[PDB]
């Protein structure tokens, strides 16, 4: 969509509500497969709750977009190259968008809590461009009310650290496993990033070895925030298990976990809501404390698609 210039990025929708348009300050990218980043501070210096997302990019030429919150972006830029980087702190993701894969709405009564003493001070907008003279604005409008929300959003990231894929190695599994600590969470959507060797990602709840699937996606598919059929009450003492499967047939050297095209990532992003009272904005698992368990896993997790 177009550029604003005289209208600016902030739109009141009334007093206790406005939308915020986060869009690249007129960019002219002359590369195919190019990742561009930029940051914007909150208008209000407080607890807002981010309640919607209106996506706006030339389907022509915009492959995928990610929006996270964090309190210190990786450059003082007008824009920059995301390979340079997002937030030098934890960038916790709010929104993801894919072309061939329209996202879903948040549920009414839900919102990511931002700013204030605790919440995120900045939004950072990663914007992937596909194949390709002029000037580009495209990106994401928000809609954030000051009105507190019943159900707070957040992310449980399960991600491998140590994984390694030996070259030509028909199959290498990577497994994450964590025990649940906080108040329960209903899980309403998901996404799954891995680079190429990604055959398939998948993730579950386990209550007395009782596997009840969350998400399953071949990560070469556009890694949107895909919805979870019927919601999943993750309570205390449940185990989050996840498996990315990769192959090594592809390249001539040892692939390890990393943020570059040549490396791999087994990330599984798990977007939940919790009761306001009990809610906390993001959890994480870098461990695989229940490793043996996984024999019990579904074979739906180990065969492809
Ligand atoms: Cu429930
Ligand atoms: Cu990556």
Residue numbers in the entry: 45 to 176, 182 to 354
Source paper text:
Despite lacking its Cu2+, the rest of the CuH site shows little change except for the absence of the side chain of residue 107.
Two enzymes, peptidylglycine α-hydroxylating monooxygenase (PHM; EC 1.14.17.3) and peptidyl-α-hydroxyglycine α-amidating lyase (PAL; EC 4.3.2.5) working sequentially are the only proteins known to catalyze this reaction. PHM, a two Cu enzyme, catalyzes the stereospecific hydroxylation of the glycine Cα of peptidylglycine substrates. The two copper atoms in PHM, CuH, and CuM (located in the N- and C-subdomains, respectively), each use a single reducing equivalent from ascorbate to catalyze the reduction of molecular oxygen for the hydroxylation of the Cα of glycine at the carboxy-terminus of the peptide substrate.
